[PDB]
């Protein structure tokens, strides 16, 4: 996470605007202005994961300057994906902003155009690996990676929409097993698996045993980045109660609630009325949510940290700590 | 041909696609979900784009090669192009403000979708190289036809941007309405994935991969592309929703349609200023208006004369194509959409 990951991959950022535009022109000037405000936003974790993931799997002898910042092009395709779903959650949550800017639907002249620059920036990734691997081995496997994720993270932005109904969350769906899914599928491919997965293949590691042992980890660290993001949102302006959320405190919430709190959550949960978010804060301070993730942070840390040192098929340890210190 | 048999042979194999993309078993609520999405989305319309894909192939492969396997291939890649077609409809009756795709309500205005329909849209698109990977990894047009899609998604992605820049601040750009914009749309919008895919990927099926029979079959298959695209701007204005199975929106939206920039053409300053007026509002009465405009300037009649002569002109660039292409595959294409009204 240093300041000098982020400026190499930064440097990166404007010949891949220059490979999607310059490299019809109003659209192409208007792609350029959808690429500079959506894609190089946030820390870039998921991108410069990918960096490292590969810094840590290829042989020295072939972390080339040229090398590693292919491994970087491959970051910014992370990055890509994941501002076409980001672009496209902002139209479906009807969210005002996201990191301190506007949504993007919600800019001038933008509106419903949004929704064609979304499929847009995702379609531009595929571009950028035909440019820069179709000459090597791991490209078709790449390809199919991305395609295989893209899928999954669908399938888990569908999943987490069967917790809503009419406006209202549907407290019946808030399991565990159910949140579970939702973040293995909508978060926790797209943004540990498939980094992890692209930095193997362009270290030429094709063992489908190696890929299944780092999933089965990234997999555990996704839960717990996104449980600890969840506990952050309400205790860490958080807006997960209004939006009402399927959120780990929501589901612990309903697990700990007698009759009487389960009626509060039925009345209050996803409301946008002040006094219903102020009242499920206090029901969450009442149900001892902070101690109870406290607990849990404790538990997830010792069960990962024991996984990663059972990690077999001759992979890098070092690797997946590097990604745990991050998140913890 | 186009037949009731090559229909069928084609619909029989869209179950099988179905089981691919959804029979992620310990999330089956999303894809008993997805099968729904599938269902309803995919296999409803006309069909010619897949059907197209699989006469292409019947007539560019070598006889003895066209077992009943081969023709099955065929018959999946045109279902690829299908689930690219109902994703584009789902993701532009949305942006089109529509309210009927295929004689029904528009997938985005079901109760419970709404914007949950731009997922529902990148994921029918992402399912379409689920199946590629199934039936085409393991042989040589695998990366070529995955090239293509990502080409043709990027190109079509790049011609719904132009389209969608006809307004701004809720006015149209009367001024920007040539038909040096409207040919730039049409091509990028609608001729790549409607016409240039379908053959080419029969071909590459066929393994075909001369760049030059290929450059071959784009000239004419822009053409057509462009011919279909006109035929469509009509059918908007001028169509029977109950045969089209849709509400035309291109005035509302301010489109810049063929019927816009022959308008903005024949035009005398007064109806140059209705245009300014009325044209891209949402009020009821300006469709009105504008309609009364079209119809005033003849340009049903336009449409006629425009349709038959580029037929003609079509027909006569076909005759001239050489680099070994079937010339009856192009007059079928041309045969199925001459004088359409859906
Ligand atoms: C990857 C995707 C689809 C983003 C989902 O984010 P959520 O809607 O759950 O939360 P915000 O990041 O918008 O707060
Ligand atoms: C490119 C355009 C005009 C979209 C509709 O295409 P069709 O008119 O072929 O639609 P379906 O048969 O698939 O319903
Ligand atoms: C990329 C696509 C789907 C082309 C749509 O063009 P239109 O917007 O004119 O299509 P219809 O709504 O008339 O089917
Ligand atoms: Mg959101
Ligand atoms: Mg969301
Ligand atoms: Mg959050
Ligand atoms: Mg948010
Ligand atoms: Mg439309
Ligand atoms: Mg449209
Ligand atoms: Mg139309």
């Given at each position: 996470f240093s300041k000098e990951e982020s400026r190499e991959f930064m440097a990166i950022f404007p010949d891949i605007v220059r490979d999607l535009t310059d490299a019809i022109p109003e659209v192409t000037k208007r792609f350029a202005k959808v690429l500079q405000y959506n894609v190089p936003?946030?820390?870039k974790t998921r991108g410069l994961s990918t960096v490292i993931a590969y810094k840590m799997l290829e042989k020295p002898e072939n972390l080339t300057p040229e090398?590693?910042?292919?491994?970087g092009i491959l970051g910014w395709c992370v990055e890509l994906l994941q501002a076409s779903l980001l672009i496209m959650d902002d139209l479906m949550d009807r969210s005002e902003t996201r990191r301190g800017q506007p949504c993007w639907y919600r800019q001038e002249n933008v509106?419903?155009?949004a929704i064609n620059d979304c499929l847009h920036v995702e379609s531009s990734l595929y571009s950028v690996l035909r440019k820069y691997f179709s000459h090597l081995p791991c490209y078709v496997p790449i390809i199919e990676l991305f395609h295989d994720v893209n899928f999954?993270?669908?399938?888990?932005?569908?999943?987490?929409?069967l917790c809503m109904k009419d406006g209202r969350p549907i407290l019946s769906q808030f399991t565990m097993k159910?949140?579970?899914?939702?973040?293995?599928?909508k978060t926790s491919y797209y943004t540990f698996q498939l980094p992890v997965s692209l930095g193997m293949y362009l270290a030429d590691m094709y063992d489908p045993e190696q890929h299944r042992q780092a999933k089965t980890i990234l997999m555990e660290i996704g839960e717990?980045?996104?449980?600890?993001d969840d506990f952050l949102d309400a205790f860490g302006v958080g807006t997960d109660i209004k939006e009402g959320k399927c959120s780990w405190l929501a589901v612990v919430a309903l697990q700990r609630s007698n009759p009487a709190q389960r009626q509060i959550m039925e009345e209050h949960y996803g409301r946008p009325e002040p006094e219903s978010t102020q009242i499920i804060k206090n029901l969450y301070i009442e149900l001892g949510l902070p101690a109870t993730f406290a607990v849990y942070e404790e538990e997830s840390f010792n069960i990962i940290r024991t996984h990663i040192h059972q990690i077999s098929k001759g992979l890098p340890h070092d690797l997946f700590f590097k990604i745990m210190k991050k998140i913890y």
């Amino acid at each position: 996470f240093s300041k000098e990951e982020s400026r190499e991959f930064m440097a990166i950022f404007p010949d891949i605007v220059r490979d999607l535009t310059d490299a019809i022109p109003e659209v192409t000037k208007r792609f350029a202005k959808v690429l500079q405000y959506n894609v190089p936003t946030g820390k870039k974790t998921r991108g410069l994961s990918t960096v490292i993931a590969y810094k840590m799997l290829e042989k020295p002898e072939n972390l080339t300057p040229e090398n590693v910042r292919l491994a970087g092009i491959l970051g910014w395709c992370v990055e890509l994906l994941q501002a076409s779903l980001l672009i496209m959650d902002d139209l479906m949550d009807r969210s005002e902003t996201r990191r301190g800017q506007p949504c993007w639907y919600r800019q001038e002249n933008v509106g419903f155009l949004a929704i064609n620059d979304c499929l847009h920036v995702e379609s531009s990734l595929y571009s950028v690996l035909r440019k820069y691997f179709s000459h090597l081995p791991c490209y078709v496997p790449i390809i199919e990676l991305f395609h295989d994720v893209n899928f999954k993270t669908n399938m888990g932005q569908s999943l987490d929409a069967l917790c809503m109904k009419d406006g209202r969350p549907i407290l019946s769906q808030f399991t565990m097993k159910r949140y579970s899914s939702i973040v293995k599928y909508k978060t926790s491919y797209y943004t540990f698996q498939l980094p992890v997965s692209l930095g193997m293949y362009l270290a030429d590691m094709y063992d489908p045993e190696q890929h299944r042992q780092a999933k089965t980890i990234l997999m555990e660290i996704g839960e717990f980045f996104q449980i600890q993001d969840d506990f952050l949102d309400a205790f860490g302006v958080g807006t997960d109660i209004k939006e009402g959320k399927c959120s780990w405190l929501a589901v612990v919430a309903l697990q700990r609630s007698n009759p009487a709190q389960r009626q509060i959550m039925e009345e209050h949960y996803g409301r946008p009325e002040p006094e219903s978010t102020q009242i499920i804060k206090n029901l969450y301070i009442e149900l001892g949510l902070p101690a109870t993730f406290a607990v849990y942070e404790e538990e997830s840390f010792n069960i990962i940290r024991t996984h990663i040192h059972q990690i077999s098929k001759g992979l890098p340890h070092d690797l997946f700590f590097k990604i745990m210190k991050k998140i913890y």
